Automatic annotation (TrEMBL), chain A:
Record flagged with keyword Transcription regulation: no
Subcellular locations according to the entry: Mitochondrion inner membrane
GO BP term, example: proton motive force-driven ATP synthesis
Residues of the full protein shown: 78 to 126 of 137
Family according to the record: Belongs to the ATPase d subunit family.
Name of the protein in its database record: ATP synthase peripheral stalk subunit d
One Gene Ontology MF term: proton transmembrane transporter activity
Major subcellular location class: mitochondrion
Keyword annotations: CF(0), Hydrogen ion transport, Ion transport, Membrane, Mitochondrion, Mitochondrion inner membrane, Transport
A GO cellular component annotation in the UniProt record: proton-transporting ATP synthase complex
Automatic annotation (TrEMBL), chain D:
Record keywords, A-Z: Membrane, Mitochondrion, Transmembrane, Transmembrane helix
Domain of life, source organism: Eukaryota
Gene expressing this chain: ATP5MK
Chief location bin: mitochondrion
Residues of the full protein shown: 9 to 50 of 58
Membrane topology: Single-pass membrane protein
Location in the cell: Mitochondrion membrane
UniProt-recorded name of the protein: ATP synthase membrane subunit k
Source organism: Sus scrofa
GO cellular component, one term: mitochondrial membrane
């Protein structure tokens, strides 16, 4: 029952992730930082191409 | 014309390369957007592997 | 006087080219989607009609301002005028 | 002042070789000398 114990919170955290994923897309012309959660940014000299 | 004496413009050119490194530094690359979709796929697949190991 | 000249360009940008996005400006962004290019249009005759998404009247006013601003410095040198007027 | 920390990570990267305007300053400052000298001898 450890799968029924541990992955139950992993189900609801994935279920809550589907709630915030609806929030981010918003308007077409929405934001330059709210779109900076899914698509990534990094430190200096990461993107080679 | 053949102008002279040069104490002018060249000190007013390097102030300009504080401007152009300010504007062009805030640009966006289309390619970086295709990279963030890759790491989201492998993370939940390993999380499902963490759930498969939670089964096995 | 710095907040005076800075509020000149931010008025001559967001009206006649091109009023950007970043919500808190989202409906302000579509305010440029209709554009004030219909307001900017009537000066030439009609002909620069292509201003819809490559906006001529947004840009061609600054470059028309930078010409007549540089006509003033050249005026002292190329005098040429008689004791009369031209044709 | 914020025309610095936007590009301050860039500066000490490449100004180690890029900020050698002293050779431009020496080739400029010597170029000052011959033109004041020719107008001195007219």
């Amino acid at each position: 029952a450890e799968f029924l114990s541990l992955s139950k919170a992993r189900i609801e955290a994935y279920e809550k992730e589907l709630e915030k994923m609806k929030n981010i897309i918003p308007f077409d012309q929405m934001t330059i930082e709210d779109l900076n959660e899914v698509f990534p940014e990094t430190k200096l000299d990461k993107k080679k191409y | 014309d053949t102008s002279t004496w040069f104490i002018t413009i060249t000190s007013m050119i390097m102030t300009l390369f504080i401007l152009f490194q300010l504007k062009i530094s805030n640009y966006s690359y289309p390619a970086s957007p295709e990279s963030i979709e890759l790491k989201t796929q492998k993370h939940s697949t390993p999380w499902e592997m963490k759930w498969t190991k939670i089964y096995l | 006087a710095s907040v005076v000249p800075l509020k000149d360009r931010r008025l001559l940008e967001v009206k006649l080219g091109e009023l950007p996005s970043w919500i808190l400006m989202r409906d302000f962004t579509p305010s440029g989607i209709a554009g004030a290019f219909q307001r900017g249009y009537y000066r030439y005759y009609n002909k620069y009609v292509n201003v819809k998404k490559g906006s001529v009247a947004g840009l061609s006013m600054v470059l028309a301002a930078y010409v007549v601003f540089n006509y003033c410095r050249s005026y002292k040198e190329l005098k040429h005028e008689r004791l009369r007027k031209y044709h | 002042q914020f025309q610095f920390t936007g590009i301050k990570k860039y500066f000490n990267s490449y100004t180690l070789t890029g900020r050698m305007n002293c050779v431009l300053a020496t080739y400029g400052g010597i170029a000052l000398l011959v033109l004041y000298f020719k107008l001195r001898s007219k």
